[PDB]
From Swiss-Prot, chain D:
Domain of life: Viruses
Name of the protein described by the UniProt record: Spike glycoprotein
Cysteines engaged in disulfide bonds, as pairs: 15-24
Residues of the full protein shown: 424 to 474 of 1356
Subunit description: Homotrimer. During virus morphogenesis, found in a complex with M proteins. Interacts with host ACE2.
């Protein structure tokens, strides 16, 4: 198949494995008309003759969308695609009706998976969502070798060895080998996407708690690839892998992006034979301080074995963590494995997951050695090197069915509405520019006066054991058991002195405050929170809510150490401050001209503040009837400030599953759309021209035509004469009549 | 008609807050429905009004005041031109009606500079007030076509007749006239001219004053209601529900997500309920207006184009003809009738 | 043309409108019920949306409070639904009144209400059923071609006595010297008599 | 009834008379001619009964 690299999804000057709905044999015959079982097709024309193709069902269904293609040739190919319901070629309900102009000799085609229809236009791919497209399993072909047409009927699960050189495709060789590749192996696409149509055979969604079983939602998941390493050859001699796929052996399949990832994902191989599934071996992690060893055994007596089961078991396996500090062989049970082990995922953050489920959490991992003792290569299908992305996922029986990355404006609309494909028409949009803002602070006059507090903890371990508990923790408030604020302003820190040991074995312990029993979070007491009075204590105080102090050894065991107690009463004598402001006599902050978070005379919100000057006689706060600041006057002077919400909403016109244009309040280019018009009360942004036949979408006195340009609406033309009078005159009196039937519907 | 309103599912609940963008996912099937209802209604209304506002260039041209002569019509006729690329403008009466009782320019709501006006202040809450359908040029084209029909009598070509003749025909309809000389016409033209002046004066500031007052009261009422509905919707944003604040940001500045999400969910529930209520109100208003449009069309056909015999319908007297002009969200009909004196 | 237009002339305009309207009615009935049903998932300020799940976790002393919150919410949803239903009935009653008028005036009798049943000269109408309603097919006449007629306002015998047609709907005209009378509506000429 | 601006008093209305009391009850500096509901609750200490 003389495909382009773009169609294949391969890098230049290289050698890769391509899997999926590929073309193979070419039906170079003059049989005119034929029908095949198919999941798609490719064809090549150059000759000046019509050709046509259709994907359909084995019977006529009035409500099935059918796919019809026609090609006509002149200088270029005029290619028409219609996806519609038909009256037993009369269409009456269409998803798409498009014309493309293509290079002669190009291989063009269609492939279907589930309800996803992919249109291959040589240089580009366009995707549509078509209800029950998977039913369209019959292919009709109208095409002869006599007129240059050749085609390949697409079946399924093809694996091809591809070689590229100097922009050309050199080799296209179908494997007789590559058994099972089509379920596990693919090429990394540009920007790290997983190819549409891939079956996520052993790819789990990661969780921290509950799992999804069936439905559609936006997830944050490690599904963008920087590398992908097939049948990697990992052996006990391999050594440690440092997350970034820059190892000497990592011959990634497809595109490679030389950066640093969030996780490594191990897609494990196994069979039905338990004796080919249980392997001796360990997983070792290099943390910032110590090696950590993970391993399992069949009985609870972990000391008797050191294994990793892959695939299905027939008995429980107990898994433990070992780590040693100067012969202090700390060892703990962690948990029981699932009946079947399919995927292991390790984060740089230290989080370790099996089949999506989090088992333990190390402080940090520099590198991993998946130390399976073996005889073969056949323990792994692939190692993936990935980062987190915002994706829309169709989940079924916990598995990924449809993965949509939302990077482009249209994909983002699909995400925003949680819907795999939209309905042509108008949609509201406001793609909030989520980010970190600077904070402004405006308040009535007051002298600045601030005190520091730290809630500190110092700890010792190894009293009789580790994992069980801390030996002792010393808790204090600036060294006291009680500290109060007697100042206008204050701020509070939390400090865990692992450093007291001089040699932080204590880095294996995590000690921190839990959410308390208080109507505030401890860590947020440094925002501009206001009290009449507070007082803090390290000892029990009647009536005082508290924040428990908890300890863990790598998030396996949990125990309470102590608590911070706090009292308070509401009012406005004491204000929390984000940091220890100094020098300043009277504290305030004001940032202008891009988004901020603000607290202004107790109005709290976000937006953009700009200076102005109007004769605003009266008070200093101006609000909407919804209670939102419109502006404020700066007390000591007459300067006024205007407050606006930077994330403005707009209206988007959608047609043929794409963005056509948009109506906005802001004089700027937008969703790829460049051509900006000014209209009496808005701007319209398009990419269309000024010559576009007819509206396809309408409102008011204008319509949006097929290419997005605007067309004025004109009232229906109609007229007649008046009633003739009793006057000597030349009258016009109807002689010949016809008839028409007018249709009216009334609900009863 | 009435103005279409479209309200953003999210902006009116959590005004640009990325935390709600996640929390609201669980209400997609209940939140999207708000937009579906509002958008559909706007669509249906636009189509319906568009189907009325037709145009005839012959009658439009013949609507010239010189076709009417002794009877005047100058305060009724659209301004022929405003030296601009526009087919027509509002008549003197229309300028009066609109000015006395009184679409948002959204381009201003991004500049800062001034304390915001009310419109932008509503825009900032995701409440958009859309452009109208019955715009001034359409209404003038429609109206002018109706008026020219008064003089475009049933002749060859598009020849017109004197309005005096047109009226004579409309008299013969009622009772065949047996007098060659039209003694009646000068009396009626003069009387008509006074009536029209009285009406315009009555609107600016005879039992016509009763009838005009009623029209004004009704026009004002329609306007007030549209404003009131939006103010209510907007005001409800301040109705802190059972939560710490009414500002989502203020909640997230104080509480971690484990509690903040609950406080915010209470606010979300409340705000979604407010939107559901609003939508119901809107739909009911559309139903009322549809009733009124049906009637209006009947009057256009029977009392403008034809001339009925439906005593008690268009005008409490002997109906000769009616004039139609635009008014805020509607039509104003001026029914010219005869009243016996002696 | 109409049947074909419905299956898939300016009749296509009119048919399209009827179809759009019929579809709209159907969609609304479905949508209302879906909303009512969907609201059952809207867990109110309680542990769950399943009453059973609440009773499996909490004794009655607390469970009854959690459930009372769910009950309040669900009753409110029903009240809202009822209001919606009643409003729809009101709308339909309006439509039924109109439909009956059209049956009487435009089917049984034949009106002269220009602008009512059909934009033209109404001859007859056919009525069929449709989803939740009636479909009317109004058969009207439309002029195609008309004649130029040399009309006279009357005859004035001896310069003294005007005579005019009694009936205002008639035209007296000169058919190249032959005087004839016609309807102002349809060109069906005849000779005049004194009794005219 | 006080009109407050920048924390300062702008307009001070004592509500002793019936009309001033209506202004207080509706929080509004001047009314619109027409009809209003009123119920000027006679706030005081009551004796308590027990049955
Ligand atoms: C309760 O307290 C209130 C709270 O403080 C009080 O309302 C305030 O009342 C004062 C009256 O004392 C307001 O007066 C403003 O004065 C501007 C200042 O100029 C005058 O004063 C200077 C100082 O007194 C003089 O130097 C200057 O006179 C000189 O210049 C003239 C012009 O060159 C000349 O003719 C004179 O000889 C002389 O040489 C002058 O006299 C004034 O600009 C201001 O603007 C309003 O009027 C403009 C004209 O109508 C509008 O263009 C502006 O657009 C203003 O109207 C807005 O406010 C009204 C009041 O809120 C609304 O009705 C309008 O609808 C409009 O509101 C819109 O815009 C607001 C944004 O601007 C927005 O928030 C609204 O939602 C809406 O969008 C005005 O006269 C003062 O501002 C009032 N202050 C506030 C904050 O409202 C109320 O009176 C008290 N209650 C009672 C019972 O009394
Ligand atoms: C179970 O619950 C845990 C609960 O904590 C959760 O783990 C946390 O995951 C997030 C995601 O996995 C980790 O937080 C950070 O994520 C960014 C993600 O990239 C996005 O954002 C950046 C910034 O907005 C964009 O540029 C980018 O395009 C993305 O859109 C990482 O980049 C952060 O890595 C930092 O640390 C590395 C190691 O310290 C550095 O190499 C990297 O440079 C980062 O430095 C930045 O952050 C420091 C933070 O202290 C700061 O000091 C530096 O200046 C700098 O800004 C980063 O990891 C978060 O860390 C995770 N939790 C833990 C314990 O680490 C699990 O995902 C959740 N699991 C599941 C399945 O739900
Ligand atoms: C009831 O509703 C109908 C709709 O159901 C209205 O009937 C139509 O009335 C208009 C005037 O009211 C008719 O007038 C004819 O319009 C044709 C349209 O021209 C435009 O479109 C062509 C095609 O798209 C363009 O090339 C052209 O530039 C225009 O933009 C003209 O083409 C007709 O003129 C021709 O025929 C006459 C008659 O044979 C010749 O004298 C002229 O030279 C010319 O060749 C003409 O104007 C339209 O036909 C009517 N519709 C129907 C269905 O017949 C009815 O008026 C309405 N109301 C009532 C009471 O009847
Ligand atoms: C996942 O693990 C399975 C192992 O559990 C692995 O499948 C095995 O692959 C090899 C490698 O892909 C197979 O091929 C064998 O090669 C040796 C080569 O000299 C032959 O001797 C073998 O002959 C036996 O099997 C034939 C086929 O059944 C018989 O005809 C012959 O008598 C012999 O018994 C054989 O071809 C091996 O079959 C399969 N193993 C299984 C269980 O099928 C799989 O590839 C893994 N894949 C990856 C990527 O990890
Ligand atoms: C994780 O840390 C744990 C914490 O201590 C480790 O547990 C220890 O594991 C070793 C092996 O796992 C035990 O070995 C002991 O060996 C003595 C000596 O006899 C054995 O050797 C002679 C010579 O090879 C042979 O003849 C005998 O048959 C024995 O095989 C035994 O007598 C003990 O019975 C025992 O097996 C340690 O005692 C043991 N710890 C505990 C608490 O038992 C665990 O290894 C670490 N896990 C990993 C994977 O490294
Ligand atoms: C809160 O805890 C810290 C630790 O318990 C105590 O304040 C710390 O004071 C030092 C000295 O004033 C600060 O500066 C440090 O100086 C050394 C030597 O020049 C330098 O290496 C360090 O980089 C640093 O500058 C230290 O910043 C400050 N620590 C913090 C977190 O602010 C502070 O005293 C506590 N609060 C109270 C009430 O005691
Ligand atoms: C929306 O943004 C465009 C941004 O390009 C604004 O239009 C631009 O307006 C300037 C100012 O009127 C144009 O005139 C230029 O002025 C400089 C200074 O006098 C002179 O050196 C240049 O030769 C030129 O005249 C500029 O042509 C024009 N931009 C374009 C593309 O024509 C536009 O007005 C903004 N529109 C609104 C409504 O805010
Ligand atoms: C908690 O404080 C005690 C009290 O300050 C610390 O133990 C003291 O250690 C010094 C140095 O070894 C001895 O001279 C004192 O006699 C010890 N005090 C007591 C009461 O035994 C303890 O080590 C601190 N613990 C932690 C975890 O920091
Ligand atoms: C592991 O050994 C280091 C030495 O190998 C221990 O840290 C030292 O402990 C001695 C006395 O016990 C102190 O003098 C040193 O100054 C310590 N080191 C530092 C940097 O302060 C370490 O505690 C042992 N760690 C264990 C058992 O956890
Ligand atoms: C109604 O008839 C006019 C009369 O011929 C049409 O002719 C022109 O159409 C263009 C484009 O449609 C307009 O810019 C011109 O203003 C129209 N001409 C004139 C003289 O007004 C017009 O298309 C017809 N149809 C409609 C719906 O208006
Ligand atoms: C009845 O007499 C009046 C007088 O003969 C005729 O109306 C005149 O029509 C011409 C038409 O160009 C106008 O210039 C005159 O000003 C009209 N004159 C007057 C005095 O009204 C009328 O046509 C006669 N015929 C009919 C049918 O009424
Ligand atoms: C009535 O017709 C006159 C007919 O002449 C209109 O006035 C003319 O408007 C054009 C507009 O482009 C000017 O060139 C002519 O010079 C004007 N006429 C005169 C006499 O000055 C007049 O506007 C029309 N009146 C109405 C109500 O439509
Ligand atoms: C093919 O796609 C690239 C983007 O991947 C674009 O730059 C190029 O112009 C396209 N070429 C053609 C012939 O469409
Ligand atoms: C598609 O499969 C059938 C079996 O399903 C096979 O006969 C056919 O030749 C295959 N297609 C191609 C292009 O070879
Ligand atoms: C693909 O080609 C390279 C070059 O022929 C060879 O190294 C590789 O093993 C081939 N892979 C397959 C699946 O045949
Ligand atoms: C309380 O803290 C101060 C902190 O500098 C310290 O001097 C004091 O001795 C502590 N109080 C007690 C009772 O020890
Ligand atoms: C935007 O904010 C950054 C801080 O967030 C500041 O450097 C920059 O000047 C800002 N202003 C504008 C208008 O870009
Ligand atoms: C003041 O108002 C004018 C009013 O015309 C505006 O141009 C100017 O930018 C304003 N802003 C400031 C801070 O001066």
């Amino acid at each position: 198949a003389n495909l382009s690299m773009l169609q294949l999804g391969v890098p230049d000057n290289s050698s890769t494995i391509v899997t999926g709905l590929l073309p193979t044999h070419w039906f170079c015959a003059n049989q005119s008309t034929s029908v095949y079982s198919a999941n798609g097709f490719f064809y090549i024309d150059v000759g000046n003759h019509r050709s046509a193709f259709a994907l359909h069902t084995g019977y006529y269904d009035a409500n099935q969308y059918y796919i019809y293609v026609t090609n006509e040739i002149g200088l270029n190919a005029s290619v028409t695609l219609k996806i519609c319901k038909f009256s037993r070629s009369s269409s009456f309900d269409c998803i798409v009706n498009l014309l493309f102009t293509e290079q002669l000799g190009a291989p063009l085609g269609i492939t279907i998976s589930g309800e996803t229809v992919r249109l291959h236009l040589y240089n580009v791919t366009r995707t549509f969502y078509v209800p029950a497209a998977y039913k369209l399993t019959k292919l009709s072909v109208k095409c002869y070798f006599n007129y240059s047409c050749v085609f390949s009927v697409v079946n399924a699960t093809v694996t091809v060895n591809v070689t590229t050189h100097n922009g050309r495709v050199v080799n296209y060789t179908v494997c007789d080998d590559c058994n099972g590749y089509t379920d596990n192996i693919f090429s990394v696409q540009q920007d790290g996407r997983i190819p549409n149509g891939f079956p996520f055979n052993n790819w789990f969604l990661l969780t921290n708690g509950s799992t999804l079983v069936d439905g559609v939602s936006r997830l944050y998941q490690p599904l963008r690839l920087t590398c992908l390493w097939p049948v990697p050859g990992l052996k006990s001699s391999t050594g440690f892998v440092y997350f970034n796929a820059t190892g000497s052996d990592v011959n990634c399949n497809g595109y490679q992006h030389n950066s640093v990832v969030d996780v490594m994902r191990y897609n494990l191989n196994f069979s039905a034979n338990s004796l080919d599934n249980l392997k001796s071996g360990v997983i070792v992690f290099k943390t910032l301080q110590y090696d950590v060893l993970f391993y399992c055994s069949n009985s609870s007596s972990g000391v008797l074995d050191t294994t990793i089961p892959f695939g299905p078991s027939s008995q429980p396996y107990y898994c433990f963590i070992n780590s040693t500090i100067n012969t202090t062989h700390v060892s703990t049970f962690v948990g029981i494995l699932p009946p079947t082990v399919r995927e292991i995922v390790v984060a740089r953050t230290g989080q370790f997951y099996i089949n999506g489920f989090k088992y333990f959490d190390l402080g940090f991992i520099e590198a991993v050695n998946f130390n399976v003792t073996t005889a073969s290569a056949t323990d792994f299908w692939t190692v993936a090197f990935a980062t987190f992305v915002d994706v829309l996922v169709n989940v079924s029986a916990t598995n990924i069915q449809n993965l949509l990355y939302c990077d482009s404006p249209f994909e983002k609309l699909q995400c925003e509405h949680l819907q795999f494909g939209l309905q042509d028409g108008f949609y509201s949009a406001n793609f909030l520019d989520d980010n970190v803002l600077p904070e402004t602070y405006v308040a009535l006059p007051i002298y600045y006066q601030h005190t520091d507090i730290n809630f500190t903890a110092t700890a010792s371990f190894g009293g009789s054991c580790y994992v069980c508990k801390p030996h002792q923790v010393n808790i204090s408030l600036n060294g006291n058991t009680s500290v109060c604020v007697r100042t206008s302003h204050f701020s509070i820190r939390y400090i865990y002195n692992r450093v007291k040991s001089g040699s932080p074995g204590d880095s294996s312990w995590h000690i921190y405050l839990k959410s308390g029993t208080c109507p505030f979070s401890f860590s947020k007491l440094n925002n501009f929170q206001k009290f009449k009075t507070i007082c803090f204590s390290t000892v029990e105080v009647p009536g005082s809510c508290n924040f428990p102090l908890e300890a863990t050894w790598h998030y396996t065991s949990y125990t309470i150490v102590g608590a911070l107690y706090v009292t308070w009463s509401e009012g406005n004598s004491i204000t929390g401050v984000p940091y220890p402001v100094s020098g300043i006599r009277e504290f305030s902050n004001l940032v202008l001209n891009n988004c901020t978070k603000y607290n202004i005379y107790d109005y709290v919100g976000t937006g953009i503040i700009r200076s102005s000057n109007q004769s605003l006689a009266g008070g200093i706060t101006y609000v909407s009837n919804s209670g939102n600041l419109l502006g404020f006057k700066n007390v000591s002077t007459g300067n006024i400030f205007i407050v606006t919400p930077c994330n403005q909403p707009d209206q988007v016109a959608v047609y043929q599953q794409s963005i056509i244009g948009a109506m906005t309040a802001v004089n700027e280019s937008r969703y790829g759309l460049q051509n900006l018009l000014q209209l009496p009360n808005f701007y319209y942004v398009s990419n269309g021209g000024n010559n576009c036949t007819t509206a396809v979408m309408t409102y008011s006195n204008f319509g949006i035509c097929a290419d997005g340009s605007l067309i004025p609406v004109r009232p229906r033309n109609s007229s007649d004469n008046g009633i003739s009078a009793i006057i000597t005159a030349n009258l016009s009196i109807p002689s010949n009549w016809t008839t028409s039937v007018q249709v009216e519907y009334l609900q009863i | 008609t009435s103005t279409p309103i479209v309200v953003d599912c999210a902006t009116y609940v959590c005004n640009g807050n990325p935390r709600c963008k996640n929390l609201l996912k669980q209400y997609t099937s209940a939140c999207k429905t708000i937009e579906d209802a509002l958008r559909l209604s706007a669509h249906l209304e636009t189509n319906d009004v568009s189907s009325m506002l037709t145009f005839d260039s012959n009658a439009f041209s013949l609507a010239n005041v010189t076709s009417f002569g002794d009877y005047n019509l100058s305060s009724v006729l659209p301004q022929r031109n405003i030296r601009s690329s526009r087919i027509a403008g509002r008549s003197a009466l229309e300028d009066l009606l609109f000015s006395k009782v009184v679409d948002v320019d959204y381009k201003s709501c991004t500049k800062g500079l001034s304390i915001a006006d009310l419109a932008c202040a509503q825009y900032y809450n995701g409440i958009m007030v859309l452009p109208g359908v019955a715009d001034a040029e359409r209404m003038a084209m429609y109206t002018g076509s109706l008026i020219g029909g008064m003089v475009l009598g049933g002749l060859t070509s598009a020849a017109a007749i004197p309005f005096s003749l047109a009226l004579q025909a409309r008299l013969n309809y009622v009772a065949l006239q047996t007098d060659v000389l039209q003694e009646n016409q000068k009396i009626l033209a003069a009387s008509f001219n006074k009536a029209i002046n009285n009406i315009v004066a009555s609107f600016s500031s005879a039992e016509a004053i009763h009838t005009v007052t009623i029209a004004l009261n009704k026009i004002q009422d329609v306007v007030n209601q549209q404003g009131s509905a939006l103010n209510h919707l907007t005001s409800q944003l301040r109705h802190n529900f059972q939560a710490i604040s009414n500002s989502i940001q203020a909640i997230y500045d104080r509480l971690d997500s484990i509690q903040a999400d609950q406080q915010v969910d209470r606010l979300i529930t409340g705000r979604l309920a407010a939107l559901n209520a609003f939508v119901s109100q809107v739909l009911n208003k559309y139903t009322e207006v549809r009733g009124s449009r049906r009637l209006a069309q009947q009057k256009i056909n029977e009392c403008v184009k034809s001339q009925s015999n439906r005593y008690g319908f268009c005008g409490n007297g002997t109906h000769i003809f009616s004039i139609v002009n635009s008014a805020p969200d509607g039509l104003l009909f001026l029914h010219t009738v005869l009243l016996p004196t002696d | 043309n109409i049947v074909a237009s419905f299956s898939s002339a300016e009749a296509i305009h009119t048919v399209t409108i009827a179809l759009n309207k019929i579809q709209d009615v159907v969609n609304q009935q479905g949508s209302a019920l879906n909303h009512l049903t969907s609201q059952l998932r809207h867990n109110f300020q309680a542990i769950s949306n399943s009453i059973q799940a609440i009773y499996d976790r909490l004794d009655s002393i607390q469970a009854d409070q959690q459930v009372d919150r769910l009950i309040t919410g669900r009753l409110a949803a029903l009240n809202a639904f009822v209001s919606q239903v009643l409003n729809k009935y009101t709308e339909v009653r309006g439509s039924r009144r109109l439909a009956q008028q059209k049956i009487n005036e435009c089917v049984k009798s034949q009106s002269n209400r220009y602008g009512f049943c059909g934009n033209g000269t109404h001859i007859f109408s056919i009525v069929n059923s449709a989803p939740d309603g009636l479909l009317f097919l109004h058969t009207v006449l439309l002029p195609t071609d008309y004649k130029n007629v040399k009309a006279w306002s009357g005859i004035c015998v001896d310069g003294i006595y005007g005579y005019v047609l009694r009936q205002p709907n008639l035209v007296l005209y000169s058919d190249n010297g032959v005087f004839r009378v016609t309807s102002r509506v349809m060109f069906q000429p005849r000779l005049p008599v004194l009794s005219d």
